[PDB]
Amino acid sequence: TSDIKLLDYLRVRRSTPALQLSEPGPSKGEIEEILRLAVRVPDHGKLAPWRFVVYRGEERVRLSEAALRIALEKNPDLDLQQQEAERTRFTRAPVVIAVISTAKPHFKIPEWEQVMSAGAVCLNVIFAANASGFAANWLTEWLAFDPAFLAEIGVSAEEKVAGYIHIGSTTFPPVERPRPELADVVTWVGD
Amino acid sequence: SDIKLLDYLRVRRSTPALQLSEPGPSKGEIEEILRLAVRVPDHGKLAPWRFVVYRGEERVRLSEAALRIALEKNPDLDLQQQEAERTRFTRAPVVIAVISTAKPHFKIPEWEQVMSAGAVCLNVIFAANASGFAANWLTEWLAFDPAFLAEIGVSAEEKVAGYIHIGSTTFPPVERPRPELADVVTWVGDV
């Protein structure tokens, strides 16, 4: 329902860190609305080289344990503190949408362009989440690459996870981080 | 031109370069479009991208070059196919090249700096749309052909994220089919 001009939004959009991410999450219906909106990205060849996996409820707690398991079998036993990170890897926010790339050899489309799309679809999710009243963090901790975890959540060898998008509410004021300067990144030609 | 974010996410449509028109953004307006576009998620805050803004005459110089290389390749293409090439960059007032500059970092995977480039291209479209300009995200032979890349100064450690053609549009674009959530999203857990 809530309104924000597009221009004011681009000037102010700021991610919220997963810890700062409180409850409530969104209803399955709100969430369907967010994705129905995110899958409206540029996609050369009209291929939809991505897929989403929505994690919410108790199953987050169960995954974070699969992640705690793998993590220790990885490193016998170090800091108990770090072990909490793994217990709450997926429970810091109410919902976590995993954005999987499913890019592969195509007869006309380069996996590069199919990858640029998943790049863009990840921002379109953050865009739909903020526009829908929620705050978002786009992570990919080791869980994105560690093959013992990737198997436990169903992303194959032929796929790469693009990001885990934690969605929630928050009571925390956005603070700005340093941005790139245009003398440093943009370059002009012709007038 | 004062549009709201939620409605915007529902109607957002690329209009093709071919039907993009004069006037484009002033250097002023372009600077803001990019000042706005470089605020993207970006692990390691290392800005793995750069932009090149092709305007006015150097657009013809470049299209002219495309055609030269497209004749070196195949010295007998129709006066039609030649037209297209001497037209590549003169379809829209402005053309902004987004370049990925991803190299091995010591903490940030190259994959995550590529995700950020995809992000940045949409973000530019958002900034351009938000400023009253249509925009089409192209990448044709000219994004991958090493002959041409060398004339525009895109190194070997670099790849072109896309050529974002930006201009003014008279009528809104017709929508195209989007994915069915049923096909592209699976749900895990309940509440």
Ligand SMILES: Cc1cc2nc3c(=O)[nH]c(=O)nc-3n(C[C@H](O)[C@H](O)[C@H](O)COP(=O)(O)O)c2cc1C
């Ligand atoms: C990385 C990337 C490269 C693309 N290159 C082309 C191209 O060379 N020619 C073309 O007709 N469309 C190309 N497209 C598709 C267009 O941008 C098309 O306008 C877009 O898919 C429509 O998306 P929209 O309706 O959500 O705005 C590309 C899309 C992406 C993400």
Ligand SMILES: Cc1cc2nc3c(=O)[nH]c(=O)nc-3n(C[C@H](O)[C@H](O)[C@H](O)COP(=O)(O)O)c2cc1C
């Ligand atoms: C593909 C990708 C993976 C990321 N993974 C992490 C992570 O595992 N941990 C972390 O503290 N930040 C991570 N980040 C950075 C953030 O998302 C951070 O919110 C971003 O740099 C903030 O940009 P913004 O203030 O314009 O929203 C990642 C960014 C991208 C594009």
